[PDB]
Amino acid sequence: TTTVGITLKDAVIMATERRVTMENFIMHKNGKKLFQIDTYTGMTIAGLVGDAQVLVRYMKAELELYRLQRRVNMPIEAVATLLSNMLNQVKYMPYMVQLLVGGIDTAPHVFSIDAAGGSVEDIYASTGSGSPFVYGVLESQYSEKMTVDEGVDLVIRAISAAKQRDSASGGMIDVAVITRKDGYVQLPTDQIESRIRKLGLIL
C-alpha cells in the first residue's frame, strides 16, 4: 500500500497503488483505495481493507447528509475532525487503518489521520508500507511552486519509486486531481500510463 497527497497552489493531487496482498501473496492485483467522499473532497485509505471500506461508507453518508441539511460542503478540517472523533471513540477495539483526507474549501488541505484519531494537516503526506520511499522522493523533489502537470508527474515518480523497493505495492496507479474549477477529477488510465511510458518507468 502506498498513498500520496500533495498540496499545490490551488490543487490537491492524491494517488495510490492498486494491489491487495496477504503477507507475501498478491491476492488481488487490482484494488480500489482512492475514493471520492464529497464533491471537492477525496479520501485515500491504507491499512486493513475491511475497516477502511466501512469508514468510506460512513464518511460518504455523513458528508452527503451534511450537504443536504446545510446546502454547503463540509470544510476539510471538519471532515478530519469528524473522522478523528469516529476513530477515537473506539480506540481500544480500534480500526487498524491510516487515512488521508484531501480537499478544497477555500485553500487546499491535506490531513493525515492515524488509527487513534490524530489528525495533522501537512503540505504533503503519505501512508502505507511504501510511505518512506515516497517521503524520500518528496523531500528532494517537491517544490510548492509547481504546476499541476509537474505535480502529477511528481506523484507518479514517487509511487513508481516505491513500487520497486516495496513488495506490498504494485499494479496500476490511481491519480486524482482536485481543483475548484472542475473539482474531483480522476485521471484516466491511458493518460497516466502515457505519463509512465513518457517518463521512462515500468508499470
Binding site: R70, V72, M74, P75, E77, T81, L82, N85
Partner: peptide, 10 residues
C-alpha cells in the same frame, strides 16, 4: 463533533 458552528439553522 465538527470543530466549528458552521450553520445556525441546524
Amino acid at each position: 463533533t465538527y470543530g466549528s458552528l458552521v450553520n445556525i439553522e441546524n
